[PDB]
Amino acid sequence: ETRPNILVVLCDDLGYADVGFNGSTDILTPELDNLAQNGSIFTSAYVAHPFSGPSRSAILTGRYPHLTGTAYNLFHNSSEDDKDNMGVPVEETYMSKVLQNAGYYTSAIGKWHLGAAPKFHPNKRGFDDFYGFLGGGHDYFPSEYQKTYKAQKKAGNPNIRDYVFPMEHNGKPANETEYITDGFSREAIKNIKIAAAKKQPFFIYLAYNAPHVPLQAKAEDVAKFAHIKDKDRRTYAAMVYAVDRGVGKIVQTLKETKQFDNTLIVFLSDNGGNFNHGANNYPLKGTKGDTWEGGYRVPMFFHWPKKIKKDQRFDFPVSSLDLYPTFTGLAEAKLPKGKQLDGKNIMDDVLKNTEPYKDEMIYSLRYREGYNDVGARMGDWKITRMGNEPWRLHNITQDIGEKKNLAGRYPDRLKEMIAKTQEWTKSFVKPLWVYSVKDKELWESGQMPNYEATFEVDKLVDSPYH
Amino acid sequence: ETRPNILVVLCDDLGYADVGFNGSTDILTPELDNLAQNGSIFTSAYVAHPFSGPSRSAILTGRYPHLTGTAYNLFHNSSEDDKDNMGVPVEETYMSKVLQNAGYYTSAIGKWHLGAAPKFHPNKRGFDDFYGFLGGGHDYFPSEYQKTYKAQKKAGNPNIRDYVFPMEHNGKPANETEYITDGFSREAIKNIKIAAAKKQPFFIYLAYNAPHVPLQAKAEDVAKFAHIKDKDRRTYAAMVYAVDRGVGKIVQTLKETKQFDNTLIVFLSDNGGNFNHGANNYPLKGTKGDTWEGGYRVPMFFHWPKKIKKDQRFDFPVSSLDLYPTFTGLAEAKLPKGKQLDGKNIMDDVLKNTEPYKDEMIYSLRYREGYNDVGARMGDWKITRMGNEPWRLHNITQDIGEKKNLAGRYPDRLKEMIAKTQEWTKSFVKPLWVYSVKDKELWESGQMPNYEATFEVDKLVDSPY
Ligand SMILES: O=S(=O)(O)O[C@@H]1[C@H](O[C@H]2O[C@@H]3CO[C@@H]([C@H]3O[C@@H]3O[C@H](CO)[C@H](O)[C@H](O[C@H]4O[C@@H]5CO[C@@H]([C@H]5O)[C@H]4OS(=O)(=O)O)[C@H]3O)[C@H]2OS(=O)(=O)O)[C@@H](O)[C@H](O)O[C@@H]1CO
Ligand SMILES: O=S(=O)(O)O[C@@H]1[C@H](O[C@H]2O[C@@H]3CO[C@@H]([C@H]3O[C@@H]3O[C@H](CO)[C@H](O)[C@H](O[C@H]4O[C@@H]5CO[C@@H]([C@H]5O)[C@H]4OS(=O)(=O)O)[C@H]3O)[C@H]2OS(=O)(=O)O)[C@@H](O)[C@H](O)O[C@@H]1CO
Ligand SMILES: [Br-]
Ligand SMILES: [Br-]
Numbered sequence: 001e002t003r004p005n006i007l008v009v010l011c012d013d014l015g016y017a018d019v020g021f022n023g024s025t026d027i028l029t030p031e032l033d034n035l036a037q038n039g040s041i042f043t044s045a046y047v048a049h050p051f052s053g054p055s056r057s058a059i060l061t062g063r064y065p066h067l068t069g070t071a072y073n074l075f076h077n078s079s080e081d082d083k084d085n086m087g088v089p090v091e092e093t094y095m096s097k098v099l100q101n102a103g104y105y106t107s108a109i110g111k112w113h114l115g116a117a118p119k120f121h122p123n124k125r126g127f128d129d130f131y132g133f134l135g136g137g138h139d140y141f142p143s144e145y146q147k148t149y150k151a152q153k154k155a156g157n158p159n160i161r162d163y164v165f166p167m168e169h170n171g172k173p174a175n176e177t178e179y180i181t182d183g184f185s186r187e188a189i190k191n192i193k194i195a196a197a198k199k200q201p202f203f204i205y206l207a208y209n210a211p212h213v214p215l216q217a218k219a220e221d222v223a224k225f226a227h228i229k230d231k232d233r234r235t236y237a238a239m240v241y242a243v244d245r246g247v248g249k250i251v252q253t254l255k256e257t258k259q260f261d262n263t264l265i266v267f268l269s270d271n272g273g274n275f276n277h278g279a280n281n282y283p284l285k286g287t288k289g290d291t292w293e294g295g296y297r298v299p300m301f302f303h304w305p306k307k308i309k310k311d312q313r314f315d316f317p318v319s320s321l322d323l324y325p326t327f328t329g330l331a332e333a334k335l336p337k338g339k340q341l342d343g344k345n346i347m348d349d350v351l352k353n354t355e356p357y358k359d360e361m362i363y364s365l366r367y368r369e370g371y372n373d374v375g376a377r378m379g380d381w382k383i384t385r386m387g388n389e390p391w392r393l394h395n396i397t398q399d400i401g402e403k404k405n406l407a408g409r410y411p412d413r414l415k416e417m418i419a420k421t422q423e424w425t426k427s428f429v430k431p432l433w434v435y436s437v438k439d440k441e442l443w444e445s446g447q448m449p450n451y452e453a454t455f456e457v458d459k460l461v462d463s464p465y466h
Numbered sequence: 467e468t469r470p471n472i473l474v475v476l477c478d479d480l481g482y483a484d485v486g487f488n489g490s491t492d493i494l495t496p497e498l499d500n501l502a503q504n505g506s507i508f509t510s511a512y513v514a515h516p517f518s519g520p521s522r523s524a525i526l527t528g529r530y531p532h533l534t535g536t537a538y539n540l541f542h543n544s545s546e547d548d549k550d551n552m553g554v555p556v557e558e559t560y561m562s563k564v565l566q567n568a569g570y571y572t573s574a575i576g577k578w579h580l581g582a583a584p585k586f587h588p589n590k591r592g593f594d595d596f597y598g599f600l601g602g603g604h605d606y607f608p609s610e611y612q613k614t615y616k617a618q619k620k621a622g623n624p625n626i627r628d629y630v631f632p633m634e635h636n637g638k639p640a641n642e643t644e645y646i647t648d649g650f651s652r653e654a655i656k657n658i659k660i661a662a663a664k665k666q667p668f669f670i671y672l673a674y675n676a677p678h679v680p681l682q683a684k685a686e687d688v689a690k691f692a693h694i695k696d697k698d699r700r701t702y703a704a705m706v707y708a709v710d711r712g713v714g715k716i717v718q719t720l721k722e723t724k725q726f727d728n729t730l731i732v733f734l735s736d737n738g739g740n741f742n743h744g745a746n747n748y749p750l751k752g753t754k755g756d757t758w759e760g761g762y763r764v765p766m767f768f769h770w771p772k773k774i775k776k777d778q779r780f781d782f783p784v785s786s787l788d789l790y791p792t793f794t795g796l797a798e799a800k801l802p803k804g805k806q807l808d809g810k811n812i813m814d815d816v817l818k819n820t821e822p823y824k825d826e827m828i829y830s831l832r833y834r835e836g837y838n839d840v841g842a843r844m845g846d847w848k849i850t851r852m853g854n855e856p857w858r859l860h861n862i863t864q865d866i867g868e869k870k871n872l873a874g875r876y877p878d879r880l881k882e883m884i885a886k887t888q889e890w891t892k893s894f895v896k897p898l899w900v901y902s903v904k905d906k907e908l909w910e911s912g913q914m915p916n917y918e919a920t921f922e923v924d925k926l927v928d929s930p931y
């Protein structure tokens with residue numbers, strides 16, 4: 001057996017400038033930085049959607065959420081009955097199931113957000129082990145949330161928020177006793193040791209909910225950030241530091257079990273930081289949920305000592321959609337018949353420092369209340385529509401903050417990129433669920449999605465009097 | 467004659483953190499800072515719209531642009547024919563004309579943006595003198611724009627941008643020879659001296675186009691800002707510094723003419739900074755054009771040595787709409803019959819440190835392509851809708867950056883403020899012009915303005931399941 005172990009370390013709402021290797025000056029991430037410095041830092045890494053549910057759907061299915069009907073978040077406490085189909089389609093085979101069928105020991109830890117009904121459960125979607133929670137977020141201290149859950153259960157509360165539900169281990173009570181970031185790190189260590197004892201390659205999907213709200217941190221970690229005056233930034237920094245501590249213990253475990261050299265560690269965020277709740281996306285414009293770069297360009301590194309050189313910087317754009325074909329290629333796994341994928345097996349490009357998306361697009365489209373936000377990048381160029389304002393064209397390599405609209409200078413390039421992006425939307429399916437009552441009314445009237453209006457150009461800038 | 471002179475120094479797209487007295491750490495504005503420190507700094511000053519045309523219309527008419535039909539910008543090179551009525555309604559009397567009729571010597575300098583046809587001209591709107599340009603912006607170096615203008619005319623260009631048109635002085639060519647910020651400062655000094663010789667109180671509307679794009683600065687000013695590493699912010703800083711130099715020369719002139727003590731100087735920006743083009747609105751969220759605070763909360767001071775004490779900070783919210791009734795009050799000027807005003811005479815509130823908008827609203831509504839952005843503030847509380855997202859309630863005193871939505875914590879307060887804001891929109895008129903072809907299509911179909919949809923609340927947050 002020479003196939004590598006694969007560890008995905010996925011943070012939740014981690015800001016672009018909030019790890020040291022991607023520019024942080026106030027948040028300390030020495031363990032993540034050491035891995036990044038000993039592998040490949042991706043300076044133009046994108047997720048397939050600027051917020052969690054659709055982004056995580058894309059990671060595990062390998063498809064844009066607009067093709068699977070999962071481009072809106074599931075609501076909190078979404079239906080746990082199979083009959084309601086509130087989850088990613090079961091026919092869309094996850095890479096975990098592909099790796100499991102190829103003989104990998106598979107483990108999911110932390111946040112799911114891909115369906116709370118039994119047919120959507122991690123154990124039915126290719127994970128031998130699951131430890132975590134099914135919804136979109138969770139309170140961080142068991143001594144707090146277990147007391148709240150128990151009191152509200154006894155009081156007969158019918159609206160108990162899923163943020164205080166007991167976590168689970170393979171459908172049984174987890175009985176967590178630690179700050180849950182530490183608990184997730186503990187379970188990752190355990191599953192690494194299980195794989196080593198089995199002498200089986202592992203795939204671990206470690207989906208920390210940190211630094212997603214609520215901003216809750218251990219006093220021991222907060223103490224290391226007294227140099228930060230803003231309380232939210234200080235708490236957020238401590239939350240990221242807790243992840244870094246866990247990564248350090250995971251690395252030590254990989255070394256002890258002699259799995260370190262032939263493990264591919266992939267670290268990223270599921271979307272941009274929310275700059276209302278502690279995050280910093282510098283030098284990108286915008287925030288979680290935007291199609292500015294700040295919404296869906298994320299930190300990422302690959303660390304794999306057997307193959308990936310130290311101190312590498314990979315500057316060509318890549319997508320979290322690339323993880324599915326890259327991982328199944330490394331696992332020598334056969335895809336299910338008819339499986340469709342929107343990403344690329346990029347490992348050879350990473351090893352050769354070549355451009356996987358040369359002359360091809362990486363996209364985002366985010367549904368708003370009556371219009372769509374869009375981003376589309378090819379090479380050095382990006383088109384952006386935000387707030388239904390006029391279309392922008394940016395040289396994103398020379399103008400990473402999207403400050404200088406070049407649409408008037410290069411109209412032909414703008415319209416070529418518009419045409420390809422519009423063609424992409426012709427492949428979309430209807431959402432299986434929307435998020436608000438407003439959404440439902442808009443889709444039912446045809447006011448959404450109205451892709452045709454999204455790709456208007458001239459009428460947004462022309463005067464009716466000239 | 468006891469009435470004070472009034473000098474309005476209005477910058478164009480000046481960011482919230484881009485003058486020293488309002489928190490700048492890198493842009494140097496010693497003359498403006500000295501005036502602010504010797505008067506009253508307004509820490510919650512608002513303009514009536516988050517971009518220039520409608521904001522400037524509101525300043526001179528004293529009414530929200532939604533009541534005068536002027537809530538969109540005029541397009542570049544807008545019609546110069548009276549028949550097309552591309553300008554602020556002539557019936558909506560400007561405070562310049564009221565002051566002129568009250569015996570003030572009146573002068574407008576720099577940017578207009580209120581109509582380029584003759585009936586909209588400053589000289590027809592209460593200004594004895596006008597030196598500047600009629601449209602929305604201008605290139606800064608005459609040696610550059612006069613060369614481009616003359617060449618494009620010879621090239622038979624039918625679409626010459628008004629940014630390079632020759633400036634004017636009372637309808638005649640201005641023949642400007644200086645960096646135009648310096649030229650505007652020079653003309654302000656001249657008009658101060660004219661009023662001193664006339665022994666007439668002056669009203670001077672000094673509408674610098676700085677620091678609005680294009681980012682163009684003098685080498686002598688750029689040399690002061692080597693500590694600014696970002697290239698656009700360095701140029702932008704030098705553009706603000708040139709305004710500061712001119713203010714210093716204006717102050718020296720007021721002292722020499724013995725007008726300084728009884729001049730009210732009001733300094734402000736017409737809207738928030740554009741953070742794509744050098745500006746910084748810290749600690750506010752957002753940028754020019756938004757209904758986040760960063761779009762329309764601006765730096766402002768009042769300086770008037772005879773009455774306003776030094777080292778004052780005025781923390782209650784105020785509006786640029788207050789300038790019209792405050793100035794006409796100081797001028798003891800009678801308003802025209804039927805004139806309506808949306809602001810307040812706030813001078814006694816400023817001197818007494820009392821709250822002019824107690825239990826009342828300061829508003830913004832900005833039209834977008836198919837929806838409306840809104841902001842509304844009463845006391846410590848603000849409601850915001852941006853991008854047609856769910857409504858937000860902020861304690862703007864505790865949460866100036868609009869980071870923490872309290873809509874779920876205080877739903878009754880949110881809905882009370884929304885109800886009052888919706889009632890305000892019931893008074894609106896139709897825009898006399900819109901900006902884009904898309905705007906025209908949306909208004910003609912009835913998709914705009916749809917104020918009813920703007921004030922939906924519950925359906926934006928409730929799940930259908
Ligand atoms: O009254 S409540 O606010 O509901 O009660 C509060 C606590 O619940 C809240 O906790 C977080 C703050 O608001 C919600 C939580 O954040 C949300 O988490 C989601 C995942 O669980 C998701 O990440 C949300 O972002 C999305 O929001 C919608 C849907 O997709 C888009 C957007 O359209 C995402 O954002 S963006 O556009 O990409 O930026 C995120 O905002 C809320 O919980 S929940 O979401 O209602 O479940 C509650 O736990 C506590 O007890 O009381 C709090 C009181 O304020
Ligand atoms: O082809 S161009 O790019 O137009 O040519 C350029 C030069 O003209 C430009 O110069 C500035 C950059 O874009 C325009 C100028 O900025 C604009 O100035 C306006 C005032 O003159 C106004 O401030 C504009 O903001 C508004 O834009 C619309 C209308 O109201 C809102 C928004 O909906 C305002 O913005 S916001 O929402 O509040 O933020 C501002 O963007 C452009 O000039 S013009 O506007 O076309 O007249 C040109 O002079 C030179 O020759 O070539 C340049 C090449 O790029
Ligand atoms: Br599956
Ligand atoms: Br638990």
Ligand SMILES: [Br-]
Nearest residue numbers: 258259260261
């Ligand atoms: Br090893």
Ligand SMILES: [Br-]
Nearest residue numbers: 559560563591
């Ligand atoms: Br008038």
Ligand SMILES: [Br-]
Nearest residue numbers: 632633641642
């Ligand atoms: Br000139």
Ligand SMILES: [Br-]
Nearest residue numbers: 724725726727
């Ligand atoms: Br004096």
Ligand SMILES: [Ca+2]
Nearest residue numbers: 012013052270
């Ligand atoms: Ca997330």
Ligand SMILES: [Ca+2]
Nearest residue numbers: 478479518736
């Ligand atoms: Ca302006």
Ligand SMILES: [Cl-]
Nearest residue numbers: 274276277869
């Ligand atoms: Cl938020």
Ligand SMILES: [Cl-]
Nearest residue numbers: 276287751868
């Ligand atoms: Cl926001």
Ligand SMILES: [Cl-]
Nearest residue numbers: 410411412413
């Ligand atoms: Cl082109």
Ligand SMILES: [Cl-]
Nearest residue numbers: 428429430431
């Ligand atoms: Cl479909």
Ligand SMILES: [Cl-]
Nearest residue numbers: 456457458459
């Ligand atoms: Cl069009």
Ligand SMILES: [Cl-]
Nearest residue numbers: 403405740742
């Ligand atoms: Cl811009």
Ligand SMILES: [Cl-]
Nearest residue numbers: 285402742753
């Ligand atoms: Cl912007």
Ligand SMILES: [Cl-]
Nearest residue numbers: 876877878879
């Ligand atoms: Cl209340």
Ligand SMILES: [Cl-]
Nearest residue numbers: 922923924925
């Ligand atoms: Cl509603």
